[PDB]
């Protein structure tokens, strides 16, 4: 049952990478801030999959 934990780790790492890119790209004049967006998944029913 590691799939959900692995997906959560990947999502958190992606969010941290986005934040690091945003903070690094400061003082870049032609730059627009980025924001991550997650979504829950459900294959069958009664159980989540990450």
């Amino acid at each position: 049952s590691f799939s959900q934990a692995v997906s959560g780790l990947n999502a958190a790492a992606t969010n941290l990478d986005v934040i690091g890119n945003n903070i690094a790209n400061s003082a870049t004049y032609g730059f627009k801030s980025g924001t991550a967006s997650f979504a829950d998944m459900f294959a069958g029913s009664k159980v989540g999959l990450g």
Binding site: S1, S3, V6, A43, G44, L49
Partner: protein, 260 residues
């Protein structure tokens, strides 16, 4: 040469087959798109010395007769076509389907097989083949100088090209759904061949007529529950030991019979 000996032999064989299917499930726990199997056991015929409900007298009938079993045999190993967990791989040509359906694959000898493991690649002619050299049935061809390959929610695979500023619709990727998915006869290399028990396939676009949905960059892992196989192995080992004890008891009984 006694009935109990043959009965115990059948019991041992049933336990051995159960252990074999457990070991096979554990072996390919990390095979993409793998489906586990479970074995169902059935008893053999019954030797009737006194028929139940026989007219033992003019008015009295035996409530229960004398019947002796003859063992147990395995009747089938059914596959559990459930939905596996989806994973992330971030690859252009790794497709995972959610729901029901099968990709069609053209075998070299001219027949067609069906697969659930979606992890494709390109051969030297641009054909969209699977891992193993087998090519898909609709025969999607990827042109050279391609920049990126995009697969939508439905099976419309498109390619972004350098000097067009707009993707070109390379082709369509449908899939076929069977109404007896447990009935498909499996062969090696994650392929199934249509058989009599399984119905006739009817190809359709994903997302319609009960078909699944395609996701790019995902892979479907095997639906093998590791935490239950340990308990199953414990149970199987105990049953095997019990039946071996039965064989030993029968042998000692027979030896005491023949020592006089």
């Amino acid at each position: 040469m006694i009935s109990s000996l043959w009965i115990a032999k059948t019991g041992l064989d049933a336990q051995q087959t159960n252990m074999d299917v457990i070991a096979n499930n554990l072996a390919n726990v990390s095979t993409n798109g793998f489906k586990r199997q479970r074995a169902v056991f059935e008893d053999l015929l019954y030797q009737t010395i006194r028929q139940p409900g026989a007219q033992s007298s003019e008015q009295t009938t035996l409530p229960s007769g004398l019947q002796i079993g003859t063992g147990v045999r395995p009747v089938a190993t059914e596959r559990l076509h459930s939905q596996g967990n989806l994973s992330q791989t971030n690859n252009s040509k790794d497709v995972a389907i959610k729901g029901q359906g099968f990709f069609q694959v053209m075998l070299p000898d001219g027949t067609s097989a069906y697969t659930r493991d979606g992890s494709f690649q390109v051969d030297q002619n641009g054909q969209l083949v699977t891992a193993g050299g087998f090519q898909v049935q609709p025969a999607i061809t990827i042109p050279a100088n391609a920049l990126s390959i995009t697969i939508g929610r439905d099976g419309v695979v498109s390619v972004t090209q350098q000097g067009q500023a707009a993707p070109v619709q390379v082709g369509q990727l449908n899939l076929t759904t069977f109404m007896n998915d447990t009935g498909l006869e499996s062969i090696g290399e994650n392929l199934y061949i249509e058989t009599q028990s399984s119905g006739a396939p009817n190809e359709s676009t994903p997302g319609l007529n009960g078909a699944g949905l395609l996701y790019q960059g995902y892979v479907e892992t095997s639906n093998v529950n590791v935490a239950e196989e340990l308990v199953n192995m414990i149970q199987v080992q105990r049953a095997y030991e019990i039946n071996s004890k039965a064989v030993s008891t029968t042998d000692q009984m027979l030896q005491k019979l023949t020592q006089l």
